[PDB]
Amino acid sequence: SVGLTGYGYTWIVPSLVAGDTDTVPAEFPTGLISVSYDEWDYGLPARVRD
Amino acid sequence: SVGLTGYGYTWIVPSLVAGDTDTVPAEFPTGLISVSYDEWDYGLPARVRD
């Protein structure tokens, strides 16, 4: 509604805000930065051994 | 919707924007400045003589 959020107004969010990275509410600004746990490289078989 | 109508700003508009000063559309920010013709002191009897 302000609109001045997306040009020079970068946002950084934790993994809680991102939540499920598969689904995006379409209101998330492009270029959103999020800190998330390694769900891609750290596969389930690797964690069980650890 | 942006919300930045006026908080420490000032909006200057001509007499066209003000229009009829009796009615305000309730969206005009407080502190609006208009350059209106003298309808108060310059009464109609004075205008006819001039």
How many interface pairs between A and B have CB atoms less than 8 angstroms apart? 10
Experimental method: cryo-EM
With beta carbons under 8 A apart, name residues in chain A contacting B3. Answer: 1-2
* Listed resolution, Å: 3.2
Measure the CA angle with vertex B10, ends B9 and B16; round to 5°: 150
Q: CA distances (Å), A48 to each of A36, A37, B7, B34, B47, in order?
A: 20, 16, 58, 73, 95
Return d(Cα B41, Cα B39) in angstroms, integer.
6
Q: Are A3 and B4 within 8 A, CB to CB?
A: no
Q: Residue B21: what are its φ and ψ, rounded to 5°? A: -70, -15
